[PDB]
Amino acid sequence: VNIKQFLTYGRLQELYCSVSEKNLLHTLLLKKNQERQAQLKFRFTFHEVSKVLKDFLDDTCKGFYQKLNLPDMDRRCEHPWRDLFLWAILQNRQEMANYFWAMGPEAVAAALVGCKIMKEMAHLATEAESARSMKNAKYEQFAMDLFSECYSNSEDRAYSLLVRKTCCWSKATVLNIATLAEAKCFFAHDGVQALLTKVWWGAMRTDTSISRLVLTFFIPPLVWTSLIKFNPESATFIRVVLRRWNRFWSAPVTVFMGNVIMYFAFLILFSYVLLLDFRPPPPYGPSAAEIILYFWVFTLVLEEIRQSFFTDEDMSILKKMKLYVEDNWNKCDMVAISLFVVGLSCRMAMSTYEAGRTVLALDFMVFTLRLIHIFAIHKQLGPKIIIVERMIKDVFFFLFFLSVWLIAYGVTTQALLHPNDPRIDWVFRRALYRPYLHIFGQIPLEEIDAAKMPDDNCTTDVQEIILGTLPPCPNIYANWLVILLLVIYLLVTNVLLLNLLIAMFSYTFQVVQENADIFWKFQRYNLIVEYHSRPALAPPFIIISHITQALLSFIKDLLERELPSGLDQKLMTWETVQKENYLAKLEHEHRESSGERLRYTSSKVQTLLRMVGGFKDQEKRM
Amino acid sequence: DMSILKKMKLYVEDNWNKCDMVAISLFVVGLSCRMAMSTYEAGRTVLALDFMVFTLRLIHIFAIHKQLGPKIIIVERMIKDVFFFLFFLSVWLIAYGVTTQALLHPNDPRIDWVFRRALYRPYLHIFGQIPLEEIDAAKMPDDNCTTDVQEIILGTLPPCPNIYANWLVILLLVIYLLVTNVLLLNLLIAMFSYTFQVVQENADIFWKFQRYNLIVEYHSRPALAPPFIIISHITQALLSFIKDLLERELPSGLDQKLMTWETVQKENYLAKLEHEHRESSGERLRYTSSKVQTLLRMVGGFKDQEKRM
Ligand SMILES: C[C@@H]1CC[C@@]2(OC1)O[C@H]1C[C@H]3[C@@H]4CC=C5C[C@@H](OCC[C@H](CO)CO[C@@H]6O[C@H](CO)[C@@H](O[C@H]7O[C@H](CO)[C@@H](O)[C@H](O)[C@H]7O)[C@H](O)[C@H]6O)CC[C@]5(C)[C@H]4CC[C@]3(C)[C@H]1[C@@H]2C
Ligand SMILES: C[C@@H]1CC[C@@]2(OC1)O[C@H]1C[C@H]3[C@@H]4CC=C5C[C@@H](OCC[C@H](CO)CO[C@@H]6O[C@H](CO)[C@@H](O[C@H]7O[C@H](CO)[C@@H](O)[C@H](O)[C@H]7O)[C@H](O)[C@H]6O)CC[C@]5(C)[C@H]4CC[C@]3(C)[C@H]1[C@@H]2C
Ligand SMILES: C[C@@H]1CC[C@@]2(OC1)O[C@H]1C[C@H]3[C@@H]4CC=C5C[C@@H](O)CC[C@]5(C)[C@H]4CC[C@]3(C)[C@H]1[C@@H]2C
Ligand SMILES: C[C@@H]1CC[C@@]2(OC1)O[C@H]1C[C@H]3[C@@H]4CC=C5C[C@@H](O)CC[C@]5(C)[C@H]4CC[C@]3(C)[C@H]1[C@@H]2C
Ligand SMILES: *[C@@H]1O[C@H](CO)[C@@H](O)[C@H](O)[C@H]1NC(C)=O
Ligand SMILES: *[C@@H]1O[C@H](CO)[C@@H](O)[C@H](O)[C@H]1NC(C)=O
Ligand SMILES: [Ca+2]
Ligand SMILES: [Ca+2]
């Protein structure tokens, strides 16, 4: 059977129409068909398949079947193994999909696509057993093992395989598909990390010492010395010195360094303006340092705009905005920008001056916390960010129990101690703020224990309590009960509930620390990619880079590169050979396994018993 | 006798050696400053720090005991954990402290008090020092306070804390207490627990290496303890001018006998390894499958020959 001749588009559509009607793919195709019928022979059509694929990849299946809209039904599929793999993946058939992947040309990209589709469908997950089998798909492992084989083979063709635009997946890069699939374990591969290190250092050699690089950063003229080794490849002298300077000052590591230093400078200036040089409204004018801070934040806004609208390429504006706002650091920045603008606006008026100063203090808090993202560069600091996020989630869930318990205890103690205090603010103080402070050692027994209550001048008159002339007299009717409740609260809260939260923290830390390497390598990938696409200048100076880019656009890649047809075909054949070698080694390993040997021995012993019995009977005939 | 530079490099490679060097330098600087009236207090301060260094130097003798040795390594790794935790702690404390200083004392110009309220007070919150009389308006005393900047700088009266939005200051303090005191402190403690677990898994090996190092260190030391060690030093110098348990040179016959004995021991060890490998389950399975294959082929041939008859 020749699959190239066997699989026509009509045949493929017939296969898509022959879905068992008990699996998720049939339901999804039914929903697509119902939507199409509402908006406007074969039960299902390639339009429905394209829409279903769009709900899992949304960029990869660009005109897989919409190109001709519908293609000729007697025409053979241009990518038969790709189509068969996609069809066998959409319906949770993993063995068949494994076979189709083993016969397919672009296997790393196919495996990453399969892992993405498996996780998205396990998010859909109509059933639960299918969802569990689809959680353990092991396609990212196929991609990782094939790429390990490829990287061990050549280590230079592996990088090109990482960055080349695929032919079977609509010019999508393997790294693009891994990002779409969120394949954290693939990004943690040694080959991917090596390519990331090569991108990180740019023109310099990756073995460059940190001390030499920092010292050359702080002494720019020393870059023309041989202190920093660079990778191979009047007017000439100027050109070569400019080339050396640009190659050093364009590397993502130096851009990162400069951005970190200028962010420290920005925080220092922000703190100076907020704490020492915050002047009255424009009647007495903002200080010059404040205007410098305004310009700095304006350049930050320009950088945000560049990242949200003019990032790297041309897509839908809405798609680019969605990609921008999907990053949590991006929305953190947006919050900081909005807070600064509101603060500045309120500060410009006398009646809102204090509110503006308050909002600006909160904005400094937000910017300083924003500074945290640079810790992903270090293995010992990166994973702790993820730990802190999960631990914040743990705190959020613990807060339900804490709030219920504190409401009960605080209202009971407020009723027992100050039944005649009408003021609501003091009700909430004594009911929640004081019990919360008990957790951290703040136990004011002079307000709770009668024997410790001072002889202060106190009133029982409600009007005098409301007026605030004298503090209310605490009720000591049954003070033993108040003290017993405080003892119980101290035990329960401070030991039991606090250590329940701490045990939750410990479990979270243990779970993240088990996978610390993978998490940090994914973080490092994201940080290196972020600073590789950034302009070489740090804000405020980034205004120069923005102006230069705009002027270049008006007047007139390391990753995701397009290859010549011959080199592309050579790479595809090389990867196919690597996949064949990997599968052959897997088969050989399987054959020599203990279970396989046991099965072979038992079967052959059975055959030997039968044939030896026959031979013995024949001999006994003689 | 080696290269002088090699011996110095070997000396300074030991951390206890550089600890001692720090202690000696501190004592010398302290004594020198103490010799002058204008540097007397600085000399006393440096000598106090030197006592601290010497007392911590005393820790090295704990390697002699199995229950004390490994704890030194645990403490070193835990200090590294603290160093890495300090980045998060410093960033968070800078954010919170500057925000609260701006909210509470926007008119206080003095930088020392800025840094006090921005980092020293939030750090002390971690250890139960929560002065609500400076943060909560309802707990603020009726003390005699000024809003004049000149009077604040002069120090005549304490500055009046700003109570503009005190609910926000209190909410920030509540959030800081939760985040820092529970979350971040227990993140550091979980790091500590992981470090302790990793070292305690290999406690025996670490302590035995420590014991080796300590025994070797005190085997090569002169028999007299300082100050008295001056007598041993003078005796050694006099012996050098006028005129080993480990690392000993053997006669040629005994050396050859030892080499042959070790070769025989290695041969016995390798033979036992080979015998263990042969009788393993996997090897037996491989042998049985291969011989069953051979038996199938040869029995088929024999059966065909019999069927010829
Ligand atoms: C292992 C486990 C640990 C936890 C726990 O169980 C065991 O421990 C138990 C111990 C127990 C507690 C044991 C004892 C008591 C005392 C008892 O009061 C007796 C009531 C009498 C009558 O009403 C009040 O007396 C008098 O009051 C006056 C004030 O009103 C004081 O005058 C002061 O007045 C003014 C003070 O402002 C000022 O003029 C002066 O300062 C002074 O003149 C007198 O001096 C004092 O004599 C109340 C109960 C209490 C606190 C127990 C509570 C429960 C425990 C904590 C257990 C735990 C589960
Ligand atoms: C489970 C979880 C725990 C954590 C938390 O969430 C839930 O708990 C919540 C509880 C909440 C708090 C609940 C209540 C409040 C009170 C509120 O003030 C109301 C504002 C008004 C108006 O501006 C001020 O009032 C008045 O001020 C005056 C001072 O200025 C006082 O006069 C004093 O003046 C001088 C004091 O020097 C002296 O003359 C005397 O001593 C006295 O005359 C009055 O007596 C008082 O009436 C501010 C907010 C706060 C603290 C909440 C903050 C957030 C919580 C902790 C929640 C947690 C997330
Ligand atoms: C963590 C939750 C948030 C929401 C909430 O409980 C904790 O906060 C508390 C703060 C309370 C305020 C505190 C002070 C005052 C001033 C007083 O003159 C009138 C009542 C009012 C507004 C109170 C109304 C009820 C409020 C919002 C409580 C509310 C359930
Ligand atoms: C753990 C870090 C060490 C470094 C540092 O932050 C914590 O220490 C802080 C102590 C600060 C001092 C404290 C007191 C004074 C006296 C005052 O009249 C002038 C300013 C000055 C020197 C301050 C300058 C800034 C300093 C070094 C801060 C500096 C970022
Ligand atoms: C309490 O107020 C009354 C009002 O007359 C006064 O006489 C008395 O001295 C006050 N006591 C204290 C402790 O302030
Ligand atoms: C505060 O200082 C003024 C100066 O006249 C004085 O009259 C007043 O008694 C002082 N109050 C306190 C509480 O020291
Ligand atoms: Ca951003
Ligand atoms: Ca020494």
UniProtKB/Swiss-Prot annotation, chain B:
Q: What is the protein name for this chain?
A: Transient receptor potential cation channel subfamily M member 5
Domain of life, source organism: Eukaryota
* Quaternary structure annotation from Swiss-Prot or TrEMBL: Homotetramer.
> Cytoplasmic face: residue ranges?
1-15, 65-73
Role description: Monovalent cation-selective ion channel activated by intracellular Ca(2+) in a voltage- and temperature-dependent manner. Mediates the transport of Na(+), K(+) and Cs(+) ions equally well. Activated directly by increase in intracellular Ca(2+), but is impermeable to it. The activation mechanism of TRPM5 involves a multistep process.
Family of the protein in this entry: Belongs to the transient receptor (TC 1.A.4) family. LTrpC subfamily. TRPM5 sub-subfamily.
Task: Tell where it localizes.
Answer: Cell membrane
The entry marks the following residues as binding Ca(2+) 2, namely 17, 20, 217
Intramembrane spans are: 113-153
* UniProt comment concerning the protein's domains: Contains two Ca(2+)-binding sites that are allosterically coupled. The binding site in the intracellular domain modulates the voltage dependence and the accessibility of Ca(2+) in the transmembrane domain.
Q: Which residues cross the membrane?
A: 16-34, 42-64, 74-103, 166-200
Query: Span within the entire protein?
Result: 778 to 1092 of 1165
Q: Where is this motif: Selectivity filter?
A: 127-129
Query: Extracellular topology: which positions?
Result: 35-41, 104-112, 154-165
